[PDB]
Design a protein around this ligand. Structure first.
Ligand SMILES: *[C@@H]1O[C@H](CO)[C@@H](O)[C@H](O)[C@H]1NC(C)=O
Ligand SMILES: *[C@@H]1O[C@H](CO)[C@@H](O)[C@H](O)[C@H]1NC(C)=O
Ligand SMILES: *[C@@H]1O[C@H](CO)[C@@H](O)[C@H](O)[C@H]1NC(C)=O
Ligand SMILES: *[C@@H]1O[C@H](CO)[C@@H](O)[C@H](O)[C@H]1NC(C)=O
Ligand SMILES: *[C@@H]1O[C@H](CO)[C@@H](O)[C@H](O)[C@H]1NC(C)=O
Ligand SMILES: *[C@@H]1O[C@H](CO)[C@@H](O)[C@H](O)[C@H]1NC(C)=O
Ligand SMILES: *[C@@H]1O[C@H](CO)[C@@H](O)[C@H](O)[C@H]1NC(C)=O
Ligand SMILES: *[C@@H]1O[C@H](CO)[C@@H](O)[C@H](O)[C@H]1NC(C)=O
Ligand SMILES: *[C@@H]1O[C@H](CO)[C@@H](O)[C@H](O)[C@H]1NC(C)=O
Lengths: 420, 414, 211, 148, 49
């Protein structure tokens, strides 16, 4: 079939109509990024020649190829730890959680560390570890930071965020009550802070439910780890291909190097072995060139993840769609194999209502404009509201400001402005 | 390390110098438990061979021979090999050999080579393009040539189709190419399928008769039955050795195993398509051919401006298999283990780092992630800063690398 | 009359231990799910083509088939491979020793060798003039057709006889049924488990999903 | 040793050219590394076999350099686009973006030139002497809630 | 389309499958780039008359 681009929607625009949301949903959009791929190293003399002295003395005739291939994989291998430091080690102190969870009704027990585990990941970090799945001078090297260390940095960044807001990302961590922290997250998106406090139980129940959905999503939806599982699969498939190339003849009489040495003699053996050396070396240059290019892709993802750590977790971002869809409130990092997962908490408006509106209101010949917010009417009453949540105030000399006479403005309306 | 890095100065770091391998302590030879001498010397003294369209074959098995005397011998006017060197034959074994033999004119001995064409190679005796074997021939004009002509050696001049490799076809059916009906007799475009060389003592040294023997070797998945004049050693187990199972050869530990070779299986392979195990042809046990138990060597050092002292990490090796410490990354030797934790100075892996500290030694420790802090959180308490400091932070970024150019003709040739 | 090959006619391509691998090879195999002939083991044992090689099977109460002949002519005008059982060994000859031209028995030496309920399966191929034999035996789970599910035939014999073959026939000991199909050059994928054992296969040319 | 990110660009490219020059000492399986030996020891039909081994090796060596310069130049360009972004947002502006224009609350930045790169002196406000206070989300007066 | 050449090329092994794979991975990525730039909008909005 011809694919549809999405459901079609005629937006109800007209020169004096505005829709304002009367309600909200606290969404928690998850995002996943690769950070560091499998570290490898190749002992090229052992890969090409397998301790044949005859082959090793031929490989000397090529010069610096083996050392510059071992150098290129070494440069990639050190950089995998540089990425893993830059994404997680953004905080120089290891913050730890208070014992008692008086966070105003929000339930972080599913994303904070769990003492029941043998390695103290959170509950959601452990789902992410369950949903993700060499012998010929080729080797795999361990990372510098173990998963038992990364699970402490994703605790320090998280317990910082919960107890102290932006501040641990700018100076000493300052304690602040978590309900008041959310009041300054809300006031950062133009929703006036009383909209939090008057609705704090609703916001807690929406947030706790939106965290609960992520456990059910990750438990059922093993495909959600797609990016990270593919970074494992690409490196496994590349090593399997580099190993299986040892079987190829490359125009020699046999690919078992000991056949040539045990059936021919040294004058003909060099003419045959130089085909295997050229073929195995061209195979190893092909692998190392693809690892250098693939390292640049994982590095671009680690710089992006390190930037999302600094903006979304250590602060709040005004950058639309950068820290999840909706207006950004707050983000929690969670560790995953070869990667990082952000739970971006976002305020999404809902339950619009239509209103008649005007850019200005004419009083005694003066034009009044809203100080912050929009003028709106149900049809006969006139009011002013903040833009992002319907909250109708009476129009006054305080929540408005004057500029000029009523003649100049297009679509100004006649209504009385109150003076306390 | 100084040699790996091609320098006399080594900075503080960890350097990937080398690779530890357990060395082959002795060589081990494992031919089958066979005796007897192979009948090649019977073939080399036969009264005649067949006419070449009906070429003889002798199967060779359950025996040994010395080949080295043969290409030295004045008995032979030509010796050749393909896929093997004659010099190497005394070191080898084969599942079978087949000695194939006939008499032909010397000008046709050129057709006894891999993948050839012409009336011998097409219509008497085909060798394949990848033939593994040797060829032995001698001028036999003293035995096989006569006044008026020795007609008793013949070859197929014509056939309807070319022979497959080692196809033998003895029937002398008439070569009817045209409309001239065969009826068991010669005719125009219905020629006699043979010709006779008619060897006369006036023939030149190429047109003269040559007796020929072709040594068709095979070594298969099925074990050897023929060998060179070398004796077996006894077996050695669980130590690194330079092994030789019927010519299957290398460096490795002959590891005892219960690898479940099915009753017919003789050799086993790693995914690289190289041998990982063998059935010993005398002991009849599944020896895993473990390699030299290898592991990359990495060298941890403070700068040579500070000290000549050094520590060594055998990556993926256990310390029982090489002060001493078992990291998860591999066995670490020459570094003092410490229970205190510090900022990471030289990285090792799996949370370990090393440094030069107190009288100095290289220490190794689990790295410290940062100073531990508990935020004084509660539902009605806030910390507000009463003062500030204006920091200045220096951030350094590269923008443009050196604009090189290489003229490829002046570099490559000059 | 005809039936279907299903997954039958797989065999070990060499005497090599491979384990925990989806290995692949190109060789003579019986094509999967392909049309094959079926016959009664009576009187219904005519001359057949051999082509490049044969898959043969027979369903028998007490082994009624006790030999086969392979060659160009099958008639003792030239050396032709005669394969036989004597109830203690397999016996093999190439001689112009003519068996009954009506192909049953009621109960030249240029090469020689000696070693419904029973389903016997055999695979035969000739390479460089050497004759190669593979086989497996089982109790039946179906009365007339071939079994649908997997089994790998084991190597029995490899004899360097040096003979051309284009036809064959089977021979009966009397006082049951048999199946015949032909091998083709195919790429196969082979499921070697931990125990050195091929446990399943794919005929890569069977269909686009097999590709 | 603070300038590691700039000095390493100079060291990586210097090590690449010095490795590329050393490759002219390789035999590549020819009878000599030096091409005037092959032309002064051998007749044309033999020299054009030996030279073909050298050309095959030297050309594979030069493609290996140019491929790694393309990769390294893409790595430097990702840093040049980052520097061009900090010039636009930190110097020519003030940044609301946490820990992009240096640690702390960003006020201002000054660019300074350096060989092969740029050095920013980010000026940042860091709050630095706490007091601990009792707090409340709102104040109740005449039964009405007041918020700050 | 020389089979005589193709049977030599098989001796060079898996270079040919990984070249066809590398160009396939680039080719699929060109669709993903065009998806991520333009398909940021969930419903096809259209203007008033
Ligand atoms: C806002 O939406 C929630 C959805 O659970 C609902 O419970 C609540 O009553 C709504 N608010 C209003 C004022 O309708
Ligand atoms: C938080 O949620 C978990 C979900 O299993 C629940 O067991 C726990 O009792 C909740 N804690 C609080 C303080 O509500
Ligand atoms: C707003 O008014 C338009 C025009 O009557 C209508 O299409 C739209 O559905 C209304 N929206 C709501 C939220 O009722
Ligand atoms: C809005 O559109 C109507 C026609 O539908 C027009 O009469 C009216 O003057 C317009 N108002 C403004 C503010 O332009
Ligand atoms: C608004 O009020 C003034 C003063 O009463 C009057 O002159 C003007 O016509 C009014 N405008 C409208 C749109 O009725
Ligand atoms: C080290 O090797 C010995 C056997 O030599 C073994 O008993 C021990 O469990 C090994 N330790 C580790 C950590 O692998
Ligand atoms: C290190 O700590 C362990 C107990 O965890 C102890 O047995 C050992 O003696 C300590 N070593 C030193 C040098 O303190
Ligand atoms: C702020 O800190 C400085 C030292 O950095 C000190 O001299 C000054 O008096 C402090 N200001 C206050 C209000 O305490
Ligand atoms: C005041 O808060 C700081 C952390 O900001 C903490 O170190 C100190 O112990 C607190 N004082 C009291 C009396 O709790």
């Amino acid at each position: 079939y011809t694919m549809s681009l999405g459901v079609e929607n005629s937006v109800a625009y007209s020169n004096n109509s505005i829709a304002i949301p009367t309600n909200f949903t606290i969404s928690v959009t998850t995002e996943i990024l690769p950070v560091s791929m499998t570290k490898t190293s190749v002992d090229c003399t052992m890969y090409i020649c397998g301790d044949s002295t005859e082959c090793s003395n031929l490989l000397l005739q090529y010069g610096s190829f083996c050392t510059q291939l071992n150098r290129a994989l070494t440069g990639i291998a050190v950089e995998q730890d540089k990425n893993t430091q830059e994404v997680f080690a953004q905080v120089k102190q290891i913050y730890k959680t208070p014992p008692i969870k008086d966070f105003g009704g929000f339930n972080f027990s599913q994303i904070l560390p769990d003492p029941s585990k043998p390695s103290k990941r959170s509950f959601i970090e452990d789902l992410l570890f369950n949903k993700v799945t060499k012998f010929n001078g080729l080797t795999v090297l361990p990372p510098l930071l173990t998963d038992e260390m990364i699970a402490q940095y994703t605790s320090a960044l998280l317990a910082g965020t919960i107890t102290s807001g932006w501040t641990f990302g700018a100076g000493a961590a300052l304690q602040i009550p978590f309900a008041m922290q959310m009041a300054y997250r809300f006031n950062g998106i133009g929703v006036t802070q009383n909209v939090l406090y008057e609705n704090q139980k609703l916001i807690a129940n929406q947030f706790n439910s939106a965290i609960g959905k992520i456990q059910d999503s990750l438990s059922s939806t093993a495909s959600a780890l797609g990016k990270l599982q593919d970074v494992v699969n690409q490196n496994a498939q590349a090593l399997n291909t580099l190993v299986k190339q040892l079987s190829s003849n490359f125009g020699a009489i046999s690919s078992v190097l000991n056949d040539i040495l045990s059936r021919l003699d040294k004058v003909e053996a060099e003419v045959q072995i130089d085909r295997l050396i050229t073929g195995r070396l061209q195979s190893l240059q092909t692998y190392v060139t693809q690892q250098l290019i693939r390292a640049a892709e994982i590095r671009a993802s680690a710089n992006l993840a390190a930037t999302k750590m600094s903006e979304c977790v250590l602060g709040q971002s005004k950058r639309v769609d950068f820290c999840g869809k909706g207006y950004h409130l707050m983000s929690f990092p969670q560790s995953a194999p070869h990667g990082v997962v952000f739970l971006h908490v976002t305020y999404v408006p809902a339950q619009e209502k239509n209103f008649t509106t005007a850019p200005a209101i004419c009083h005694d010949g003066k034009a009044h404009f809203p100080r912050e917010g929009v003028f709106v009417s149900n049809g006969t009453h006139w009011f002013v509201t903040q833009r992002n949540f319907y909250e109708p105030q009476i129009i006054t000399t305080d929540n408005t400001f004057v500029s000029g006479n009523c003649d100049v403005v297009i679509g100004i309306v006649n209504n009385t402005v109150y003076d306390p | 390390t100084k040699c790996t890095l091609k320098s006399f100065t080594v900075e503080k770091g960890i350097y990937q110098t080398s690779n530890f391998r357990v060395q082959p302590t002795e060589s081990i030879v494992r031919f089958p438990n066979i005796t007897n001498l192979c009948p090649f010397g019977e073939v080399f003294n036969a009264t005649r061979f067949a006419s070449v369209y009906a070429w003889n074959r002798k199967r060779i098995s359950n025996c040994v021979a010395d080949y080295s005397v043969l290409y030295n011998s004045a008995s032979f006017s030509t010796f050749k090999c393909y896929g093997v060197s004659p010099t190497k034959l005394n070191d080898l074994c084969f599942t079978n050999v087949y000695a194939d033999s006939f008499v032909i004119r010397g000008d046709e001995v050129r057709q006894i080579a891999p993948g050839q064409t012409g009336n011998i190679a097409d219509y008497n005796y085909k060798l394949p393009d990848d033939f593994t074997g040797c060829v032995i021939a001698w001028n036999s004009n003293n035995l096989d040539s006569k006044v008026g002509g020795n007609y008793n050696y013949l070859y197929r001049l014509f056939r309807k189709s070319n022979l497959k490799p080692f196809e033998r076809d003895i029937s002398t059916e008439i070569y009817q190419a045209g409309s001239t009906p065969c009826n068991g007799v010669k005719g125009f475009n219905c020629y006699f399928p043979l010709q006779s060389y008619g060897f006369q003592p006036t023939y030149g040294v190429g047109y003269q008769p040559y007796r020929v023997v072709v040594l068709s070797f095979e070594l298969l998945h099925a074990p050897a039955t023929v060998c060179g004049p070398k004796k077996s050693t006894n077996l050695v187990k669980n130590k690194c050795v330079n092994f030789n199972f019927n010519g299957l050869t290398g460096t490795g530990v002959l590891t005892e195993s219960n690898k479940k070779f099915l009753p017919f299986q003789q050799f086993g392979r790693d995914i690289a398509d190289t041998t990982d195990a063998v059935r010993d042809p005398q002991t009849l046990e599944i020896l895993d051919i473990t390699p030299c138990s290898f592991g990359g060597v990495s060298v941890i050092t403070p700068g040579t401006n500070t000290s000549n002292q050094v520590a060594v990490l055998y990556q993926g090796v256990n310390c029982t298999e090489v002060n001493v410490f078992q990291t998860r990354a591999g066995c670490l030797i020459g570094a003092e283990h410490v229970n205190n934790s510090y900022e990471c100075d030289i990285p090792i892996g799996a949370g370990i780092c090393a440094s030069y500290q107190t009288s100095q030694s290289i220490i190794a420790y689990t790295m410290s992630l940062g100073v531990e802090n508990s935020v004084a959180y509660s539902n009605n308490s806030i910390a507000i800063p009463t003062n500030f400091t204006i920091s200045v932070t220096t951030e350094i970024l590269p923008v443009s690398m050196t604009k090189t150019s290489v003229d490829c003709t002046m570099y490559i040739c000059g | 009359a005809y039936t279907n090959s299903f997954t039958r006619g797989v065999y070990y391509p060499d005497k090599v231990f491979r384990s925990s691998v989806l290995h692949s090879t190109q060789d003579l195999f019986l094509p999967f799910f392909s049309n094959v002939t079926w016959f009664h083991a009576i009187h219904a044992n005519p001359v057949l083509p051999f082509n490049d090689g044969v898959y043969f099977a027979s369903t028998e109460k007490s082994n009624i088939i006790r030999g086969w002949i392979f060659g160009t002519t099958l008639d003792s005008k030239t050396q032709s491979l005669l394969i036989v059982n004597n109830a203690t060994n397999v016996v093999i000859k190439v001689c112009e020793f003519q068996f009954c031209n009506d192909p049953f028995l009621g109960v030249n030496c240029t090469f020689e060798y000696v070693s419904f309920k029973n389903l016997r399966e055999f695979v035969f191929k000739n390479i460089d003039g050497y004759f190669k034999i593979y086989s497996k035996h089982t109790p039946i789970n179906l009365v007339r057709g071939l079994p649908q599910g997997f089994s790998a035939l084991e190597p029995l014999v490899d004899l360097p006889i040096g003979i051309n073959i284009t036809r064959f026939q089977t021979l009966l000991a009397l006082h049951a049924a048999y199946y015949v199909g032909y091998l083709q050059p195919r790429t196969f994928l082979l499921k070697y488990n931990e125990n050195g054992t091929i446990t399943d296969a794919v005929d890569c040319a069977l269909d686009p999903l097999s590709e």
